């Protein structure tokens, strides 16, 4: 018996996983001076 044909393609590949949450922003400079 003659060899058959190839099967279809494997199902889609999984979506890639999300990324790592970015690092927190830099702390704000200190407030202004005080009212004498």
């Amino acid at each position: 018996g003659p060899p058959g044909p190839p099967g279809p393609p494997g199902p889609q590949g999984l979506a890639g996983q999300r990324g790592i949450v970015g690092l927190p922003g830099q702390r704000g400079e200190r407030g202004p001076p005080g009212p004498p």
């Binding site: 590949g13 996983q17 790592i20 690092l23 927190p24 830099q26 702390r27």
Partner: protein, 367 residues
């Protein structure tokens, strides 16, 4: 680790590969080498061998291609998917295609060919993506200059083929488990509001707004820091985090290593050369008093005066009763000092110099 579905493997122990075409990104030799070396990481831990035939049909055809290329899995241009490989088998079987649209390098720059190749070749031998974040077989490109198989990749690959005939027997780095007693630390810092604990080439990110501990390669944020840190402390005043490794340190401003590091600790701080390294460190809330622990003695540095304080080689066992003889890590949070040694964490009270609460090192997590 995960063995590809269907358990594809090669029947022939002596394989051959071929670099069909080349990328105009790196000199043909740097590529031959990069691939040569990569194939070695796998053969180093198995009975397998990888010979390179310069023409004809090889068991693994390596090529560089763009977008669509007669193979069902088109590339996405720059970024994202860097490459793919097919499980073992005849014809297209066991092949590797690198997304040419990428800038392939032989350095630290984005997309070091060697590091991306070692992964691909994992699929080419019969391995699939590992759920272990520290494995080479983890669907994520990270790179700290070095490229090795993690104990996980070694186990998985030897599950398919067996061990190297080498008499010594190679071993890889193991990944830490947040909730596992016996877990210990190298350094603990408070980078910007959160707290990051370090263990090997990994960090465990703890943030108040979120419930989960995040484990990952320290290289995610800082590729150029040295592997295996010794101490680390944040200095609010100058939004800086200093990491220590032996006789010198690195200053990081958020996500960027400052210009000029590493830098020796003796010149920058003033330690005796008898101190070959720092064991732990933490700096006062706002008083600018950084403490560096060295074995059973500690030093206090005045951040503002940029110089040590009056005769400070003091014993820890005095100004800090109880805590112990050695410190692995330390950090200040809520006016309290949390000392870490071995598996125990002490909640030291600076105000009344008293050990308030002994507790598990991993206690700070959700276990």
């Amino acid at each position: 680790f995960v063995l590809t579905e269907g358990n594809p493997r090669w029947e022939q122990t002596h394989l051959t590969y071929r670099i069909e075409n080349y990328t105009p990104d790196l000199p043909r030799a740097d590529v031959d080498h990069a691939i040569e070396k990569a194939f070695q990481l796998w053969s180093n831990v198995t009975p397998l061998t990888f010979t390179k035939v310069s023409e004809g049909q090889a068991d693994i055809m390596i090529s560089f291609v763009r977008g669509d290329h007669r193979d069902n899995s088109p590339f996405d241009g720059p970024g994202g998917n860097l490459a793919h490989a097919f499980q073992p088998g005849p014809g297209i079987g066991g092949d590797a295609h690198f997304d040419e649209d990428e800038r392939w390098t032989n350095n630290f720059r984005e997309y070091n060919l060697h590091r991306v190749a070692a992964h691909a070749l994992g699929h080419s031998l019969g391995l699939s993506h590992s759920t272990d974040i520290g494995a080479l077989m983890y669907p994520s490109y990270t790179f700290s200059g070095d490229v090795q198989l993690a104990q996980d990749d070694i186990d998985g690959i030897q599950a398919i083929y067996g061990r190297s005939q080498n008499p010594v027997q190679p071993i890889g780095p193991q990944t830490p488990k947040a909730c596992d007693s016996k877990l210990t630390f190298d350094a603990i810092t408070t980078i910007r509001g959160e707290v990051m604990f370090f263990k090997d080439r990994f960090y465990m990110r703890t943030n108040p707004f979120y419930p989960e501990v995040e484990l990952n390669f320290i290289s995610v944020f800082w590729p150029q820091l040295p592997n295996g840190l010794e101490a680390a402390y944040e200095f609010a005043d100058r939004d800086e985090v200093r990491f220590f490794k032996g006789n010198k340190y690195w200053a990081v401003q958020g996500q960027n290593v400052l210009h000029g590091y590493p830098k020796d600790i003796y010149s920058s701080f003033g330690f005796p050369r008898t101190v070959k390294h720092i064991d732990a460190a933490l700096s006062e809330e706002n008083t600018g008093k950084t403490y560096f622990f060295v074995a059973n003695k500690y030093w206090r540095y005045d951040e503002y005066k940029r110089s040590m304080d009056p005769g400070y080689p003091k014993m820890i066992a005095h100004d800090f009763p109880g805590i112990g003889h050695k410190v692995d890590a330390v950090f200040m949070k809520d006016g309290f000092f949390y000392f870490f040694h071995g598996t125990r964490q002490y909640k030291f009270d600076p105000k009344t110099k008293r050990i308030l609460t002994l507790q598990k090192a991993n206690s700070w997590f959700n276990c």
